[PDB]
Amino acid sequence: SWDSVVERIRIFLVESPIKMGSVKRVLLEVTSADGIVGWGEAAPWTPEAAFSALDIYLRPLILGAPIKRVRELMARMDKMLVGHGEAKAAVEMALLDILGKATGLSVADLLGGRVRDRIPLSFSIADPDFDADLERMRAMVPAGHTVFKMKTGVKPHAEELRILETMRGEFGERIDLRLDFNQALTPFGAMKILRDVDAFRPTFIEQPVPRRHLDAMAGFAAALDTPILADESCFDAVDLMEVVRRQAADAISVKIMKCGGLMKAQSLMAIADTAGLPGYGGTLWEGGIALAAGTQLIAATPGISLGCEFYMPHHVLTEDVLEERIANSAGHVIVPDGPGLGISISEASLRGNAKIL
């Protein structure tokens, strides 16, 4: 029978290299009274904000807290501080890492158990040189990649239509093709654009207009066969209840840190499953600790059936603090095996692959 309390934390502001460059990351190391270590990462969606949140506001809540009572601590952190979802999620992550390691269970195991072992990984089609992208697809489809997301509303509409025509002409339904307008359309004049791309039967169209325009989003969903997916229209459980009530979307992207962590993401998905709205894992931060957390969540959350994608594939994380990277192959992320988050971090791996501020 395992019971133990948090004994100390270390908060690290680290710099990590990318190539498209630098990015800063907040990592939290929690250590129990019986010696077991767990890691969390606060990924924004300003790292100084998160960094201070943990160091001053949340520190006296973490310290002493019983590690088996994660939901209880999250309710304490939400009562004392308002809306630092990223920092709170790093604490939850780390406590679940510890609890998992102490009991021989993964985080997925502690969230109802795995329902899948791999997660479809979307490949972004966003190259100004479409021919460059076509050859990538030409190699990737035979290698088992099926999920592609085309950035749309960037080139003249006619050109984007010819591109979609070329893609459906070669691949037909062998690709699971999604479109993303990145909120760039206005409700005025969006419908002719959306109706044109709806003829190619994309699996979904992501958030064509900004967060406010729920009636416009409901209008699109009502007129179009193609599923409309809410991203910025749905951050949390409250937004989701309004999306359902207005029928403003057919699917939602789940943002572990926008919604406020792993348990909150599963609560969100209970609503969505009842309402018949599939979830998409959204943009996962490539930082190994936050990515491990997201992969475990999705592994244990059957309604998140639309796969996932990386924060911005066009700039890849070159060195990380994990002893071993979370792996992807043939169009899917491999859900790391092993207790807790299923990752390891040593002093050397940390202080030798990131510059500590």
List binding-site positions for Mg(2+). Answer: 206, 221, 224, 231-232
How far is residue 326's CA from residue 337's CA, in Å, rounded to a whole number? 10
Give 42 or 221: the residue with its C-beta nearer to Mg ion.
Answer: 221
Q: Which of 115, 154, 161, 184 binds its own copies (CB under 8 A)?
A: 115
Nearest Cα residue to 55 out of 78, 81, 24: 81
Return the DSSP state at 340.
B
221 binds Mg ion (CB under 5 A): yes
Tokens found for residue 305 = 């059936």
86 binds Mg ion (CB under 5 A): no
Give 11-76 as a DSSP string.
Answer: EEEEEEEEE--EEEEEEEEEEETTS-EEEEEE----HHHHHHIIIIIIHHHHTT-BTT-HHHHHHH
Please state whether 143 falls in left (phi above 0), alpha (psi between -120 and 50) or beta: alpha
Q: Is 88 a catalytic residue?
A: no
Q: Which of 90, 147, 251, 350 binds its own copies (CB under 8 A)?
A: 251
Site string for its own copies, 162-201 (x = CB under 8 A): ------------------------xxxx-xx--x-----x
Least CB distance from residue 133 to its own copies, whole Å?
25
Tell me the C-alpha to C-alpha distance, in Å, between residue 223 and each of 138, 145, 228, 231: 33, 31, 11, 19
Q: Which of 29, 250, 309, 320 binds its own copies (CB under 8 A)?
A: 250
Give 16 or 226: the residue with its C-beta nearer to its own copies.
Answer: 226
Tell me the C-alpha to C-alpha distance, in Å, between residue 78 and each of 73, 110, 217, 271: 9, 22, 30, 21
Residues 150, 186, 123, CA angle at the centre, nearest 5°? 10
Site string for its own copies, 196-235 (x = CB under 8 A): -----x-x-----x-xxx-xx--x--x--xxx--------
Give 118 or 136: the residue with its C-beta nearer to its own copies.
Answer: 118
How far is residue 198's CA from residue 161's CA, in Å, rounded to a whole number? 11
Please enumerate, by residue number, every residue annotated as part of a binding site: 206, 221, 224, 231-232
Q: Is 173 a catalytic residue?
A: no
Tokens found for residue 86 = 């990223």
Nearest Cα residue to 171 out of 208, 201, 138, 218: 138
Q: Among residues 160, 309, 319, 355, which one is catalytic?
A: 309
CB-based closest residue to Mg ion: 231
Q: Which of its own copies, Mg ion, none has residue 178 at its interface (CB below 5 to 8 Å by kind)?
A: none
Q: Which of 62, 94, 230, 277 binds its own copies (CB under 8 A)?
A: 277
Q: Among residues 88, 151, 319, 347, which one is catalytic?
A: 151
Length in residues, the chain? 357
53 binds Mg ion (CB under 5 A): no
Nearest Cα residue to 262 out of 37, 112, 67: 112
Please report, as residue ranges, which positions from 12 to 71 form the binding site for its own copies (by CB under 8 A): 46, 48-49, 51-53, 66, 68-71
Q: Which of Mg ion, its own copies, none has residue 275 at its interface (CB below 5 to 8 Å by kind)?
A: its own copies
Q: Which of its own copies, Mg ion, none has residue 231 at its interface (CB below 5 to 8 Å by kind)?
A: Mg ion
Q: Which of 13, 31, 114, 140 binds its own copies (CB under 8 A)?
A: 114
How far is residue 47's CA from residue 86's CA, in Å, rounded to a whole number? 10
309 binds Mg ion (CB under 5 A): no
237 binds its own copies (CB under 8 A): yes
Q: Which residues contact 67 (CB under 8 A, 6 or more apart)?
A: 4, 5, 6, 32, 95, 98, 99, 102
* Radius of gyration of the CA atoms of the chain, in A: 21
CB hemisphere CA count around 4 (13 angstroms): 21
Residues with catalytic roles: 151, 309
Applying CB under 8 A, which residues contact its own copies?
1-2, 46, 48-49, 51-53, 66, 68-72, 75, 103-105, 109-110, 112-115, 186-189, 191-192, 195, 201, 203, 209, 211-213, 215-216, 219, 222, 225-227, 237-238, 240-241, 244-245, 247, 250-251, 263, 266-268, 270-271, 273-278, 300, 302, 338-339
